Design an enzyme around this catalytic site. Structure first.
Site, PDB file in Angstrom:
ATOM      1  N   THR A 103     -13.233 -29.468  19.894  1.00 35.17           N
ATOM      2  CA  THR A 103     -12.479 -29.067  18.661  1.00 35.17           C
ATOM      3  C   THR A 103     -13.337 -29.333  17.415  1.00 35.17           C
ATOM      4  O   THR A 103     -14.061 -30.357  17.380  1.00 35.17           O
ATOM      5  CB  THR A 103     -11.138 -29.803  18.549  1.00 35.17           C
ATOM      6  OG1 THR A 103     -10.304 -29.391  19.628  1.00 35.17           O
ATOM      7  CG2 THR A 103     -10.408 -29.529  17.254  1.00 35.17           C
ATOM      8  N   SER A 104     -13.243 -28.443  16.427  1.00 40.75           N
ATOM      9  CA  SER A 104     -13.886 -28.586  15.103  1.00 40.75           C
ATOM     10  C   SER A 104     -12.861 -28.199  14.039  1.00 40.75           C
ATOM     11  O   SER A 104     -12.353 -27.067  14.106  1.00 40.75           O
ATOM     12  CB  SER A 104     -15.145 -27.752  15.019  1.00 40.75           C
ATOM     13  OG  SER A 104     -15.987 -27.996  16.136  1.00 40.75           O
TER      14      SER A 104
END
Ligand SMILES: *C(=O)[C@H]1NC[C@@](C)(O)[C@](O)([C@H](CC2CCCCC2)NC(=O)[C@H](Cc2ccc(OC)cc2)NC(=O)[C@H](CCO)NC(=O)CN2CCOCC2)O[C@@H]1C
Ligand SMILES: [Cl-]
Ligand SMILES: [Cl-]
Ligand SMILES: [Mg+2]
Ligand SMILES: [Mg+2]
Ligand SMILES: [Mg+2]
Ligand SMILES: [Mg+2]
Lengths: 244, 250, 231, 243, 196, 241, 204, 225
Positions: E1-2
């Protein structure tokens, strides 16, 4: 607080009576009569239905005679809804005994436990007692055939023949006159019906007004059979004895 | 909550009467007429929709309630008491039966559970009895069609036909004349509509009358196909139109 | 009348009779006096005996090294509230390493009494207290009534014929408030005060109970021969 | 009859007589007031000097909730301490979860709902106080008053206890003669006047004036007591006005 | 995830990739990681998907009940409820939440709640597995009071580097713009951002 | 006569505490009126500020329960606010559990089930209030559902509560006898508010200033109340025609 | 240590033409030690048959539990429970102990007394219902029973043919399991008749 | 192998019919598409009893809720109640679920994991056969599929599972939920695995089995005089 509104259902009168037990016994005096007669070879339960209507479905109807297991039945006199609560307890207690010992519960042990529940409501909790009296008809291999009665006090006793509900005084005199110890189921059937036929406040005693049952060791090969009579069979035994 | 009312509010009076049950049965009488008739091939339950205001949308107040696909209830007495008994009756059909056996309870046993709920309100601490008599009509595979009456006491009785509330004495005599063991469901709806006209003062149409049946299975009402053993609800509320159709032939 | 059956009921004039009857047990109780200067605070108590074979009921309880009370009314109630105050003084010490302020003791007692005056089943406390203490803001004397009302005073008296002592203190206010760094002259001024509330009986050696607390004085109780000096 | 013997019972009128009786305990109390100013609120209270033996300025009546709310009350004093204790729990729990200090409306309902709960059951007694309270939140100044029934509204001015009719009459004149608003330092003086004036109804015993205030400009929207020079300036103003 | 949020002149912008992974298998390639707890208060989710959904749900419930009683809650108040849950259940939660919202008083505000359940108010915030790769980039390239178009570019460039290097990130770049104007959702497909 | 102090049956089969709670309803001496548009639902209520010390902005018997649901109370404020907080709590809990906005009619049933419990539980006293719940429901459209101390609720085409309800009721019954439709046939809520005010002026025979009135409007996906200025705008329009 | 294989035991149920068969071994042991050569695993409530393999203390407990529930059921319903309904009761009763299961492999067999339709089912230890048309297997030689059944079985076998099939399924599967055998029992069930047969098998 | 995908005016669910115990087949014809409401269905993967129990529990409560609110039940309601209940049990109810249906809000498709995470999607697959299925769905899914297309794609996704995954096998069950129509449940939609006729009959000559004792069992209640 809330004290203002408490009836105090569990106290003595200055005479040493439990008001609420006594007024419940008064209620049960107005209930349809139930008679139990124990013979040498079986036990008879007869009972008088209270609500005559032509439009009541009789064959699917149960207000008086219930089954607790395969060896023990009760006849009710009082609030049927109160009796149904106690009946479901009795049914479970017989099946906890069967699960624990792998034997069918002896009749007395079941009756003492119901009677102990009734006692409870008279001494603690501040609830009203159960407005119910039971005749217990049962068999077991220690004492054979047994009649007992219980009442809102939690007192129980054993009988050769007994009545509860309306006109027990008159009913109990008539039984005491005609009952003998060497008597058989067939005779006890005739005695039970005749006694209701005299004490009933109704003009006549008809099949639509009765519940009827027998407990016979007259099943095949020395077993025990509970027969709750279907309306047609009641109408037959009413002709047979000579009441209709 | 400091609920100190742990003692009964229903007690025996010296005559052996239970006051609060008697007074609840007096509340039932003051209630609008409801009735049930059992046919060979179904049951009908019927009541008047006594609208409290002509601005009220009487469609939103149902006096006739589905309890299971095959069981239906109607009442005379205090509506709100009936409403919470419907909520409780639906739930108990699940928790004490459907979640155990994978089927719906038979009519007698669901009645038995409602009876029990009301018997408790008659003996538990700090509550009054329910101010209602229910009529419960249902079907189940092994008992067939049945009609039951439940009273504030917990007491229930099986009926071929009966009526409860306002003009129930008159209505019950009417039914005793008209009922036999060879009635078809359409014959029972006819006798239901006749009987209910005697106790109704005002308008008598599909909009002021609530009538429901326990009949054949309605697979069309199911909402899904591809399960041969679910054949559809036996309970059906007649429409405003369906009632008016039968009133022309009345 | 019809509004005195419990502490949860208001009278039509806005009165709590059960509280007012608890207040009455204080008046039937034996007199006690409290008074203070800037340096010391004093309890003087007229102890009551059942008859001449019996001991005299102890009227002065120690709560911590810097705070204690005198009681008038039901002694068992005084015990409960003194036990409660002991624990509050004790909690302050153990958790905050801090001597409980006498004004805060007052508020804790006021809120403990009050719970019994609004909730069914319970009864008011049947006792009045005079709390004395030395804390971070000098000398203190409180009067507690079981209604919940707690009042910081220079001087007061509670119990039977307490109105005598209270008028004396009300006159002597300018004199005894100045008795700084002289405990014996402050105890005199209190003994003299409690005298105004006597009738027939006079202060004997096993009759009179005194307590003191101040700047360099822990709360200490004098009974028996230790109070002969002051009779 | 018997309708008045149990709290939470409705009379045939639709009244709760125990609550109406609680109000008589309130009317019996010493006079307390609140005044809503431009940027804040002022709370004053009459304290009766029963005896010279009462230490001056030492039996404080006005209680602080959180840092920004002032509460004053007339009637059964321990009932007012019991309520504020509850107030302090509500404002703590609110700050704990939502971080911001409890707004005055939010706080007013928290008391409101608690006082109303003590009219629902016969197992409790109604509160024996009317409570005047308020403070400065993000939306400005707010003044409330809370009766034994749990009833409460916003006020320009509020007053309860024995001197209420006198106070209200004087509060209405201020509202009528200052429509653009009243400054904080003006309201403090007026509060002193109105307590003095309302001390004719309790005239037998002499009294002690206690004033607090929250003002966006004068206290940084925190609750402080009015002490020293500012208190004496208000007392002097009041003493000049009654003469 | 970013995931990130950046305050600019007109309000705040939330950014996130759309990749959800079960080890190396992409369970969902179009995940919406930008979740609404109020009209103009949104959060970015990272950690256990179950944990952060359960948390955002409870927070949405709390802020809805807040609004009923006290009206529109501050961004700070939304952060405070997230924190309360995260901190007090730290022994059973894997949640790393960025909270971002718009008032007219405070304007745009970003709070980050890392695995501690601590709270930090920041001009911008990055989190998720992909954030490690873009500390360098974001520290060098972030300015205060950027325009809307500058802030869309900064996030699109930043998340683009995060997606390139993090196997756990990827898909489309979703953003949510939060101003007085209202609530504008944006989407940017790989064929735009990859070639930056 | 303790059968008159708690919620048990009188010999007549009546619950006197339920009856006496209905009488508390009128204590405020305020009349409320709800009507339905095509797109909206409008509730007007009288606003009396007798004390010149009161902050008039804080004097209201209209509550925003949820974004969709508004609720006017006829009764004393403390019981009103008890019911408001409960409805608000039950509405937010519903949305959390079941993933959609509590419909107006389900809230009303829920609050009426709670009321019914206070008529069977002896320790709980009934609330002395009549709750009128209004929304534009995403299924049933414009909705009015009213609750009382008996635990009764029903849907309404329009309704009125208070001392002079019967006057307002017969006025509206007369209008819905002419139009023969379930609602005010009007595009804009601004003209359904105007209608409601106009029919309350006729029925009560009293005029209204901006401060004598309090209004609530439920559109699709929000319920809001009108400021004094918004009402004044409405009053002007009624006068100029 | 593994509760499902301390005592041993197998049950197999087959449908035929207007009949069902259920059969069990008679072994009870403590692992290698054989103890009882009379331990039956097939019980009946009315006309519904239940075989149970697994931990023997749970085999006994659940029988005592289903005698209890089926007795009450009959007292209230005023009729014997049916195989379809009993199957749901078993599943309910297993799943209510989800996180502390009985270590059993139940198998329901019987004929619906109304429809006349033969019915068998089996269950995992937590109540998942497998409602087979052909045959159900349970116990320490389940793999061996699957192999025997899947080859030997054919639909619509008469009562006296299904007896031969089911017997040969059990006997040959038991002989390839150390913890099963020591005698076996087969129930041939018809709508209003039930024969019970003790099989002569090898005593190792 | 369970899957679901949306089409023009509805949503469709697909599932295989194999249940495994270690490496053996316990069941060749089990129904993995569980009923929740008339037009809400749930595909089940993971622990079989857990998937069966949690769909029955929520389905029971959705029925009571529908009765209570006098409304058609919504998919987002089944979603929330499954997800809150799985979350409470922290994975220990090992149920992996695809939820789909029609309600008054339109058509919906969601996945639910054992720990209580939910996903939104136009096409979803779950269980040991999910990668085989997702490869077919990612090759052939487009927007505005017809129903004939949708059923072909869904059944192709389950076949990928049956052939290529040992965990999946036997038959394809399908359930179609189109807007303003009755949901149609198509158990054994495909039957691509019918056992070939056996070489022999193993029916024994009667008397083959050695019998020690016989006896009649008494199944009737009361043998009576
Ligand atoms: C497509 O991807 C299919 N793949 C096949 C399969 C078997 O993995 C499964 O998930 C299937 C799910 C369906 C089966 C039919 C009823 C509805 C659910 N699962 C099973 O068949 C399941 C295997 C399994 C065992 C254990 C665990 O966790 C440890 C996960 C999956 N079988 C069972 O649960 C058997 C059923 C017995 O007849 N019993 C046990 O496993 C007993 N143990 C369970 C765990 O706890 C200890 C006891 O279908 C997907 C969709
Ligand atoms: Cl996610
Ligand atoms: Cl409810
Ligand atoms: Mg990548
Ligand atoms: Mg009550
Ligand atoms: Mg062997
Ligand atoms: Mg061997």
């Amino acid at each position: 607080g809330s004290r203002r509104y408490d009836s105090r259902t569990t106290i003595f009168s200055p005479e040493g009576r439990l008001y609420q037990v006594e007024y419940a016994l008064e209620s049960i005096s107005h209930a349809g009569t139930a008679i139990g007669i124990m013979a040498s070879d079986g036990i008879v339960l007869a009972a008088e239905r209270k609500v005559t209507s032509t439009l009541l479905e009789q064959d699917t109807s149960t207000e008086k005679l219930y089954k607790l297991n395969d060896k023990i039945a009760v006849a009710v006199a009082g609030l049927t809804a109160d009796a149904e609560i106690l009946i479901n307890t009795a049914r479970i207690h017989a099946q906890n005994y069967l699960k624990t010992y792998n034997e069918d519960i002896p009749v007395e042990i079941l009756v003492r436990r119901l009677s102990d529940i009734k006692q409870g409501y008279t001494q603690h909790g501040g609830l009203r007692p159960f407005g119910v009296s039971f005749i217990y008809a049962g068999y077991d291999d220690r004492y054979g055939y047994q009649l007992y009665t219980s009442n809102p006090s939690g007192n129980y006793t054993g009988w050769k023949a007994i009545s509860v509900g309306a006109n027990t005084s008159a009913a109990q005199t008539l039984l005491q006159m005609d009952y003998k110890d060497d008597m058989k189921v067939d005779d006890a059937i005739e005695l039970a019906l005749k006694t209701l036929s005299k004490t009933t406040d109704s003009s006549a005693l008809t099949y639509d007004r009765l519940e009827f049952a027998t407990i016979r060791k007259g099943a095949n090969d020395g077993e025990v059979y509970q027969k709750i009579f279907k309306p047609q069979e009641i109408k037959d035994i009413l002709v047979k004895t000579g009441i209709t | 909550m400091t609920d100190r009312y742990s003692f009964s509010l229903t007690t025996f009076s010296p005559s052996g009467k239970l006051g609060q049950i008697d007074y609840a049965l007096t509340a039932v009488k003051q209630g609008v007429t409801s009735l049930g008739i059992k046919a060979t091939n179904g049951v009908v339950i019927a009541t008047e929709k006594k609208s409290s205001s002509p601005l009220a949308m009487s469609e939103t107040l149902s006096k006739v309630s589905l309890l299971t696909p095959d069981i239906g209830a109607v009442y005379s007495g205090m509506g709100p008491d009936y409403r919470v008994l419907v909520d409780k009756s639906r739930k108990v059909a699940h928790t004490s039966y459907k979640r155990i056996y994978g089927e719906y309870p038979p009519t007698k046993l669901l009645v038995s559970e409602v009876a029990k709920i009301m018997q408790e309100a008659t003996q538990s601490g700090g509550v009054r009895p329910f101010g209602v008599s229910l009529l419960i009509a249902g079907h189940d595979e092994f008992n067939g069609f049945s009609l039951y009456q439940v009273d504030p006491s917990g007491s229930y009785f099986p009926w071929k036909a009966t009526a409860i509330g306002k003009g129930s004495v008159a209505a019950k005599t009417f039914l005793e004349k008209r009922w036999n063991d060879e009635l078809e469901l359409e014959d029972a709806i006819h006798i239901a509509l006749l009987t209910l006209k005697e106790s109704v003062e005002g308008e008598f149409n599909g909009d002021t009358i609530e009538l429901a049946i326990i009949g054949d299975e309605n697979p069309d009402l199911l909402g899904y196909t591809g399960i041969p053993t679910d054949k559809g609800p036996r309970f059906r509320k007649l429409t405003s139109q369906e009632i008016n159709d039968r009133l022309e032939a009345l | 009348n019809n509004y005195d059956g419990d502490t949860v009921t208001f009278s039509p004039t806005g009165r709590l009779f059960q509280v007012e009857y608890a207040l009455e047990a204080i008046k039937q109780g034996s007199v006690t006096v409290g008074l203070r200067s800037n340096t010391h605070a004093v309890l003087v108590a007229l102890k009551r005996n059942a008859d001449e074979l019996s001991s005299y009921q102890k009227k002065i309880i120690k709560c911590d090294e810097h705070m204690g009370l005198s009681l008038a009314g039901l002694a068992p109630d005084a015990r409960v509230l003194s036990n409660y105050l002991r624990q509050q003084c004790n909690y302050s010490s153990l958790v905050f390493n801090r001597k409980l302020a006498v004004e805060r003791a007052g508020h804790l007692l006021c809120d403990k009494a009050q719970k019994n005056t609004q909730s069914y089943g319970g009864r008011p406390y049947g006792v009045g207290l005079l709390i004395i203490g030395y804390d971070k803001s000098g000398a203190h004397l409180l009067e507690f009534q079981p209604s919940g009302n707690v009042t910081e005073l220079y001087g007061t008296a509670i119990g039977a014929r307490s109105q005598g002592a209270k008028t004396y203190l009300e006159r002597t206010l300018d004199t005894f408030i100045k008795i700084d760094g002289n405990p014996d002259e402050l105890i005199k001024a209190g003994v003299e005060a409690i005298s105004q509330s006597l009738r027939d009986e006079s202060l004997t050696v096993d009759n009179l109970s005194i307590a003191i607390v101040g700047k360099d004085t822990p709360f200490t109780i004098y009974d028996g021969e230790a109070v002969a000096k002051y009779i | 009859t018997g309708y008045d013997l149990s709290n939470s019972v409705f009379s045939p009128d639709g009244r709760n007589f125990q609550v109406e009786y609680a109000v008589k305990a309130v009317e019996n109390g010493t006079t307390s007031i609140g005044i809503k100013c431009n940027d804040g609120v002022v709370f004053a209270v009459e304290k009766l000097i029963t005896s010279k033996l009462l230490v001056p300025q030492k039996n404080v009546k006005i209680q602080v909730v959180d840092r920004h709310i002032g509460c004053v009350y007339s009637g059964l004093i321990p009932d007012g301490r019991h309520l504020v204790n509850r107030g302090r729990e509500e404002a703590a729990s609110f700050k704990k979860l939502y971080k911001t200090p409890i707004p005055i409306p939010a706080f007013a309902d928290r008391l409101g709902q608690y006082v109303q709960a003590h009219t629902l059951y016969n197992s409790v007694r109604p509160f024996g106080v009317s409570t005047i309270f308020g403070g400065v939140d993000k939306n400005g100044a707010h003044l409330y008053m809370l009766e034994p029934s749990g009833s409460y509204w916003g006020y320009k001015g509020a007053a309860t206890g024995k001197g209420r009719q006198s106070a209200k009459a004087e509060l209405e004149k201020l509202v009528d003669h200052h429509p653009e608003g009243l400054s904080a330092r003006e309201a403090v003086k007026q509060a002193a006047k109105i307590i003095y004036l309302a001390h004719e109804d309790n005239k037998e015993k002499d009294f002690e004036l206690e004033i607090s205030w929250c003002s966006l400009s004068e206290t940084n929207g925190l609750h402080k007591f009015v002490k020293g020079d500012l208190l004496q300036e208000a007392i002097d103003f009041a003493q000049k006005e009654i003469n | 995830t970013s995931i990130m949020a950046v305050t600019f002149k007109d309000g705040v912008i939330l950014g996130a990739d759309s990749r959800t992974t079960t080890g190396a298998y992409i369970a969902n390639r179009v995940t919406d990681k930008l979740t609404r707890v109020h009209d103009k208060i949104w959060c970015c989710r990272s950690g256990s998907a179950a944990d952060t959904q359960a948390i955002a749900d409870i927070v949405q419930y709390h802020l809805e009940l807040y609004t009923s009683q006290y009206g529109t809650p501050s961004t700070e108040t939304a952060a405070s409820v997230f924190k309360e849950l995260c901190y007090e259940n730290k022994d059973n939660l894997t949640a790393g939440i960025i909270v971002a919202g718009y008032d007219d008083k405070n304007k745009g505000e970003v709070y980050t709640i890392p695995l501690g359940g601590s709270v930090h108010k920041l001009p911008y915030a990055i989190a998720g597995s992909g954030s490690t790769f873009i500390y360098g980039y974001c520290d060098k390239n972030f300015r205060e009071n950027m325009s809307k178009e500058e802030t869309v570019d900064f996030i699109k460039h930043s998340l683009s580097q995060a997606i390139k290097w993090d196997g756990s990130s990827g898909g489309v770049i979703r953003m949510v713009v939060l101003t007085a104007a209202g609530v504008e959702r944006l989407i940017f497909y790989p064929d735009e951002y990859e070639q930056l | 006569g303790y059968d008159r102090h708690i919620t048990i049956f009188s010999p007549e089969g009546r619950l006197y505490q339920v009856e006496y709670a209905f009488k508390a309803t009128n204590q405020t001496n305020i009349n409320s009126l709800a009507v339905r548009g095509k797109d909206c639902t409008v509730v007007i209520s009288q606003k009396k500020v007798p004390d010149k010390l009161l902050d008039p902005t804080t004097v209201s018997y209209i509550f925003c329960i949820s974004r969709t649901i508004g609720m006017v109370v006829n009764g004393p404020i403390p019981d009103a606010r008890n019911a408001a907080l409960r409805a608000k709590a039950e509405a937010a809990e519903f949305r959390y559990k079941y993933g959609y906005d509590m419909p107006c009619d389900v809230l009303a049933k829920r609050m009426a089930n709670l009321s019914q419990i206070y008529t069977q539980r002896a320790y709980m006293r009934p609330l002395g209030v009549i709750l009128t719940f209004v929304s534009v429901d995403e299924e049933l459209g414009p909705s009015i559902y009213k609750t009382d101390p008996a635990g009764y609720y029903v849907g309404y085409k329009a309704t009125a509560t208070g001392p002079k309800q019967q006057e307002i009721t017969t006025n509206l019954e007369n209008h819905f006898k002419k139009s023969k439709i379930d609602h005010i046939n009007e595009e804009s809520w601004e003209k359904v508010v105007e209608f409601a005010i106009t029919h309350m002026i006729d029925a009560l025979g009293t005029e209204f200033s901006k401060n004598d009135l309090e209004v609530g409007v439920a559109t699709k996906d929000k319920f809001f109340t009108l400021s004094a200025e918004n009402i004044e705008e409405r009053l002007v329009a009624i006068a100029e025609q | 240590s593994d509760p499902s294989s301390i005592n041993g035991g197998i049950v197999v149920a087959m449908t035929g033409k207007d009949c069902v068969a259920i059969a069990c071994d008679l072994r009870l042991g403590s692992q290698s030690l054989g103890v009882s050569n009379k331990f039956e695993k097939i019980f009946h409530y009315g006309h519904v048959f239940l075989g149970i393999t697994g931990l023997a203390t749970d085999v006994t407990t659940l029988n005592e539990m289903f005698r209890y529930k089926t007795n009450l059921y009959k007292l209230k319903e005023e009729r014997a429970i049916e195989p379809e309904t009993f199957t749901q009761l078993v599943s309910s009763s297993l799943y209510e102990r989800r996180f502390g299961p009985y270590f059993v492999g139940p198998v329901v067999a019987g004929i619906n007394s109304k429809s006349g339709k033969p019915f068998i089912a089996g269950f995992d230890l937590i109540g998942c219902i497998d409602e087979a048309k052909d045959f159900i297997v349970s116990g320490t030689a389940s793999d061996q029973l699957f192999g025997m059944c899947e080859s030997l079985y054919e639909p619509n076998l008469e009562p006296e043919d299904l007896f031969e099939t089911i017997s040969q399924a059990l006997l040959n599967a038991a002989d390839r399991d150390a913890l099963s055998g020591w005698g076996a029992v087969v129930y041939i069930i018809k709508k209003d008749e039930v024969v019970k047969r003790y099989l002569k098998m090898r005593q190792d | 192998t369970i899957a679901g995908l949306v089409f023009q005016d509805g949503v469709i669910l697909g599932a295989d019919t194999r249940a495994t115990n270690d490496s053996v087949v316990a069941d060749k014809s089990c129904e993995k598409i569980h009923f929740i409401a008339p037009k809400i269905y749930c595909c089940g993967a993971g622990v079989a009893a857990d998937a069966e129990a949690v769909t029955q529990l929520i389905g029971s409560n959705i029925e009571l809720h529908s009765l209570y609110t006098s409304r058609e039940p919504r998919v987002v309601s089944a979603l929330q109640m499954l997800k809150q209940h799985l979350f409470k049990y922290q994975g220990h109810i090992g149920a992996y679920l695809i939820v789909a249906g029609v309600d008054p809000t339109g058509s919906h498709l969601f996945s639910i994991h054992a720990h209580g995470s939910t996903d939104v999607g136009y096409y979803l697959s779950l269980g040991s056969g999910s990668l085989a299925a997702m490869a077919v769905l990612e090759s052939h899914w487009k927007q505005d599929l017809t129903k004939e297309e949708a059923i072909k794609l869904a059944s192709d996704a389950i076949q990928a599972g049956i052939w290529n995954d040992l965990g999946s096998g036997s038959n394809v069950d399908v359930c179609v939920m189109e807007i303003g129509k009755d949901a149609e449940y198509l158990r054994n939609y495909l039957t691509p695995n019918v056992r070939e006729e056996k070489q022999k009959s193993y029916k024994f000559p009667r008397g083959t089995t050695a019998v020690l004792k016989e006896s009649i069992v008494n199944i009737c209640d009361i043998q009576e005089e």
